[PDB]
Design an enzyme around this catalytic site. Structure first.
Site, short mmCIF file in Angstrom:
data_model
loop_
_atom_site.label_atom_id
_atom_site.label_comp_id
_atom_site.label_asym_id
_atom_site.label_seq_id
_atom_site.Cartn_x
_atom_site.Cartn_y
_atom_site.Cartn_z
N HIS C 41 43.27 39.40 42.32
CA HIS C 41 44.27 40.62 43.59
C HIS C 41 43.32 40.69 45.24
O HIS C 41 44.54 40.59 45.89
CB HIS C 41 44.15 41.54 42.86
CG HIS C 41 43.68 42.77 43.89
ND1 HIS C 41 42.67 43.69 42.47
CD2 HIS C 41 43.14 43.29 44.86
CE1 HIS C 41 41.79 44.31 43.14
NE2 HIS C 41 42.26 44.47 44.12
N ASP C 90 43.09 39.81 36.35
CA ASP C 90 42.37 40.02 37.35
C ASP C 90 40.95 39.18 37.57
O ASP C 90 40.25 40.36 38.45
CB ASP C 90 42.49 41.60 37.77
CG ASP C 90 42.00 41.33 39.19
OD1 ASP C 90 42.55 40.55 40.31
OD2 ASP C 90 42.17 42.88 40.04
N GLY C 190 38.66 48.57 47.78
CA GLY C 190 37.64 47.72 48.98
C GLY C 190 36.71 47.54 48.18
O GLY C 190 35.57 46.39 48.25
N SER C 192 36.69 45.71 44.68
CA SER C 192 37.49 44.98 44.00
C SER C 192 36.08 43.96 43.86
O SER C 192 35.95 43.69 44.68
CB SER C 192 38.33 44.76 44.14
OG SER C 192 39.59 45.68 44.06
N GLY C 193 36.57 43.35 42.86
CA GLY C 193 35.35 42.16 43.03
C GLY C 193 33.31 42.18 42.39
O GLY C 193 33.50 41.35 42.18
C1 LIG Z 1 41.23 45.14 45.70
C2 LIG Z 1 40.21 46.03 44.89
O1 LIG Z 1 39.85 46.75 45.67
C3 LIG Z 1 40.73 47.57 44.26
C4 LIG Z 1 40.17 48.13 43.61
C5 LIG Z 1 41.21 49.87 43.21
C6 LIG Z 1 40.24 50.65 42.11
N1 LIG Z 1 40.18 51.77 42.07
C7 LIG Z 1 39.70 52.68 41.00
N2 LIG Z 1 40.17 53.54 40.94
N3 LIG Z 1 38.19 52.05 39.95
N4 LIG Z 1 42.83 47.44 43.34
C8 LIG Z 1 43.40 47.55 44.15
O2 LIG Z 1 43.44 47.94 44.84
C9 LIG Z 1 44.31 47.63 43.24
C10 LIG Z 1 45.39 46.16 43.33
C11 LIG Z 1 46.50 46.18 42.53
C12 LIG Z 1 46.27 45.67 41.77
C13 LIG Z 1 47.56 44.94 40.93
C14 LIG Z 1 49.21 45.91 40.51
C15 LIG Z 1 48.79 45.60 41.96
C16 LIG Z 1 47.79 46.00 43.06
N5 LIG Z 1 45.58 49.22 43.69
C17 LIG Z 1 45.16 49.94 42.66
O3 LIG Z 1 44.68 50.18 41.67
C18 LIG Z 1 45.93 50.70 43.04
N6 LIG Z 1 45.67 51.87 42.58
C19 LIG Z 1 47.51 50.95 42.73
C20 LIG Z 1 47.89 50.78 41.36
C21 LIG Z 1 47.74 49.83 41.19
C22 LIG Z 1 47.76 49.26 39.15
C23 LIG Z 1 48.71 50.62 38.58
C24 LIG Z 1 48.64 51.90 39.63
C25 LIG Z 1 48.46 51.61 41.01
#
Ligand SMILES: *C[C@@](*)(O)[C@H](CCCNC(N)=[NH2+])NC(=O)[C@H](Cc1ccccc1)NC(=O)[C@H](N)Cc1ccccc1
Ligand SMILES: *[C@@H]1O[C@H](CO)[C@@H](O)[C@H](O)[C@H]1O
Ligand SMILES: *[C@@H]1O[C@@H](C)[C@@H](O)[C@@H](O)[C@@H]1O
Ligand SMILES: C[As](C)(=O)[O-]
Ligand SMILES: [Ca+2]
Ligand SMILES: [Ca+2]
Ligand SMILES: [Ca+2]
Ligand SMILES: [Ca+2]
Ligand SMILES: [Ca+2]
Ligand SMILES: [Ca+2]
Ligand SMILES: [Ca+2]
Ligand SMILES: [Ca+2]
Ligand SMILES: [Ca+2]
Ligand SMILES: [Cl-]
Lengths: 116, 142, 254, 75
Positions: C41, C90, C190, C192-193
């Site tokens: 993502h 992912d 931020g 992620s990964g």
């Molecule tokens: C890209 C990464 O930085 C980030 C990490 C989030 C980790 N969160 C927690 N609580 N540990 N991921 C995101 O921002 C994801 C991206 C995304 C992935 C799949 C579909 C849509 C977006 N976004 C989220 O996690 C948001 N909460 C949005 C969301 C995604 C899925 C279900 C509900 C909300």
């Protein structure tokens, strides 16, 4: 992931059933009689030997004596009872292990009956 | 127990219940009272569940009310000490004792293996780094 | 990372920082000298593929010391099964243009074998998650690498202990929950990964990748991580594969 | 495959046995036990029995609170 089911939580010290105690001995000293409860061993091990009920629970464990028209009772926080009797009358005894601070399973079952 | 004319004699727990087996009535003739006889009866009538010698592999049996408890020797477990701890050397059991990879084998003992950068030591279970910076180790703490 | 502490410099040596045009993008995990694991993502909205850089040996984003090593990302491989905008699959494998030099501050995290990961690593309760991500659901990002210890849950328990939400994604076999549902600690945007690293008998292994959640450290929810064990064979096949041309590559999965 | 049910602890003087239902038809079990913050430990591997002796684990610290779970595997 496999299908599974969780068990209820379990805290040994507070929930393990106390086993049936056994009266070890009893002897007379005039008008007093000393009753001794056997220190039942448990499954808890300390460097290869089993710990007794007293070793594990310490001051938390007390024994209740039932002796015999009413039943008379005596309590002790050791394994011995020292009771006053009557010269010539034969008495019968039964003990029960008890951990008063407990909420559930506070008492063991009664020991086999022994008489003089 | 009862023989011809014995019941002319006063009851005796020793003679009738210890030296012989007594019926509920013989017991009631000694204790007289109901609650007292009932209390003696529970344990006397219960029976010795340790009679079958249920505890295997050199375990000790302890009788209880309608049950028993087995105390096992160190290398055994189970309600009746039927389980041999040594026979449990499989990977699902604490990773077969392997420091890293464990491989199950039917017909023979399991084997341990290591990740690239490591090699299996003589003890068949531990691994040691062959390279300077193996994966998964934190240099400033080593 | 919400509710974590600063990872002392050198103690999170496999952490990777990914930057696009000098902008902080996502985290990653170094698994050897030229390969980095990250989340798919993170690359959904990338159009200028030549400005993608991976920094290793990083700690404080506000100053430069001699431990940082930068490498341009040569290739980004994602599963063909992944659909941008959704949660499943992912994960991404990144090939660096030139290998990094392993040092006291740059060391790869072990990619474990599938069975070991599923049979043993999966039952170690706590694992570390790190990143320079947001410090609060609404907050700013961290200047120093943050790390957090989180307990893992089996999906059945994760579902039972989570507050139900009307349009929430299913937790698939390619994911797992880890964290706390009391609003105290969690990974965040931020992050992620970044690696979800598990310690077993002296060595650290990669078991998860920060992926998604329903808000950072929100009451009644856990963070969701990519279950790396499901991709071990796929990852190894690709790491020994003929390097092809474009940056983005959608490799078939399984 | 069916999930075990009616998991019950049977403990007397610390001899602790976990029991459950049902009797396995084409499935075996494995038990795991842990303390709230400890790692899960497997016991009674692939057993066809509906009980598992956990005595040796719980006597390591009798004041701790333990949780166990029974997995059902198809066989
Ligand atoms: C890209 C990464 O930085 C980030 C990490 C989030 C980790 N969160 C927690 N609580 N540990 N991921 C995101 O921002 C994801 C991206 C995304 C992935 C799949 C579909 C849509 C977006 N976004 C989220 O996690 C948001 N909460 C949005 C969301 C995604 C899925 C279900 C509900 C909300
Ligand atoms: C010994 O006795 C007990 C009690 O009757 C029984 O449960 C066992 O199976 C036997 O071996
Ligand atoms: C009873 O306890 C067991 C464990 C063994 O020590 C036996 O030999 C003993 O009689
Ligand atoms: C099942 As959830 C990601 O809402 O904790
Ligand atoms: Ca007679
Ligand atoms: Ca008679
Ligand atoms: Ca008589
Ligand atoms: Ca006789
Ligand atoms: Ca006699
Ligand atoms: Ca009569
Ligand atoms: Ca008679
Ligand atoms: Ca009995
Ligand atoms: Ca820096
Ligand atoms: Cl989120």
């Amino acid at each position: 992931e496999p299908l599974y089911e969780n068990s209820p939580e379990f805290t040994p010290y507070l929930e393990t059933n106390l086993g049936q105690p056994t009266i070890q001995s009893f002897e007379q000293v005039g008008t007093k009689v000393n009753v001794t409860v056997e220190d039942e061993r448990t499954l808890v091990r300390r460097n290869n030997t089993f710990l007794s009920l007293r070793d594990v629970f310490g001051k938390d464990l007390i024994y209740t004596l039932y002796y015999w028209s009413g039943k008379k009772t005596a309590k002790t926080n050791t394994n011995e009872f020292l009771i006053d009797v009557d010269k010539g009358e034969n008495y019968c005894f039964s003990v029960q292990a008890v951990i008063p601070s407990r909420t559930v399973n506070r008492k063991s079952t009664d020991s086999p009956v022994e008489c003089m | 127990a009862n023989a011809f004319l014995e019941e002319l004699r006063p009851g005796s727990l020793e003679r009738e219940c210890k030296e012989e087996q007594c019926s509920f009535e013989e017991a009631r003739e000694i204790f007289k009272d109901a609650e007292r006889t009932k209390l003696f009866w529970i344990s006397y009538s219960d029976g010795d569940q340790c009679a079958s010698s249920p505890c295997q592999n050199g375990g000790s049996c302890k009788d209880q009310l309608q049950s028993y408890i087995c105390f096992c020797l160190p290398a055994f477990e189970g309600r009746n000490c039927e389980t041999h701890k040594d026979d449990q050397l499989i990977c699902v059991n604490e990773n077969g004792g392997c420091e890293q990879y464990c491989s199950d084998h039917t017909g023979t003992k399991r084997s341990c293996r290591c990740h690239e950068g490591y090699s299996l030591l003589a003890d068949g279970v531990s691994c040691t780094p062959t390279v300077e910076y193996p994966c998964g180790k934190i240099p400033i703490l080593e | 990372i919400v509710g974590g502490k600063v990872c002392p410099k050198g103690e999170c040596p496999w952490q990777v920082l990914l930057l696009v045009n000098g902008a902080q993008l996502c985290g990653g995990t170094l698994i050897n000298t030229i390969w980095v694991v990250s989340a798919a993502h993170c690359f959904d909205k990338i159009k200028n593929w030549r400005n993608l850089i991976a920094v290793l040996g990083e700690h404080d984003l506000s100053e430069h010391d001699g431990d940082e090593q930068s490498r341009r990302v040569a290739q980004v491989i994602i599963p063909s099964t992944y659909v941008p905008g959704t949660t499943n699959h992912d994960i991404a494998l990144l090939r660096l243009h030139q290998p990094v030099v392993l040092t006291d501050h740059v060391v790869p995290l072990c990619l474990p074998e599938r069975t070991f990961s599923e049979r043993t690593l999966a039952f170690v309760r706590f694992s570390l998650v790190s990143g320079w991500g947001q410090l609060l659901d609404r907050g700013a990002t961290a200047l120093e690498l943050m790390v957090l210890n989180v307990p893992r849950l089996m999906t059945q328990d994760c579902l039972q202990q989570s507050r139900k939400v009307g349009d929430s994604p299913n937790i698939t076999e390619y994911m797992f929950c880890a964290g706390y549902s009391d609003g105290s600690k969690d990974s965040c945007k931020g992050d992620s990964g970044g690696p979800h690293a598990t310690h077993y008998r002296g060595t650290w292994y990669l078991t998860g990748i920060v992926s998604w959640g329903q808000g950072c450290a929100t009451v009644g929810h856990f963070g969701v991580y990519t279950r790396v064990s499901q991709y071990i064979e796929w990852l190894q096949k690709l790491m020994r594969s003929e390097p092809r041309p474009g940056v983005l590559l959608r490799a078939p999965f399984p | 495959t069916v999930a075990a049910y009616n998991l019950t602890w049977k403990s007397t003087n610390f001899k602790t046995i976990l029991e459950w239902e049902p009797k396995p038809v084409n499935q075996v079990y494995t038990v795991q036990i842990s303390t709230k913050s400890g790692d899960w430990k497997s016991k009674c591997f692939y057993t066809t029995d509906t009980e598992c002796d956990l005595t040796d684990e719980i006597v390591k610290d009798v004041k701790q609170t333990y949780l166990a779970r029974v997995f059902s595997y198809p066989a």
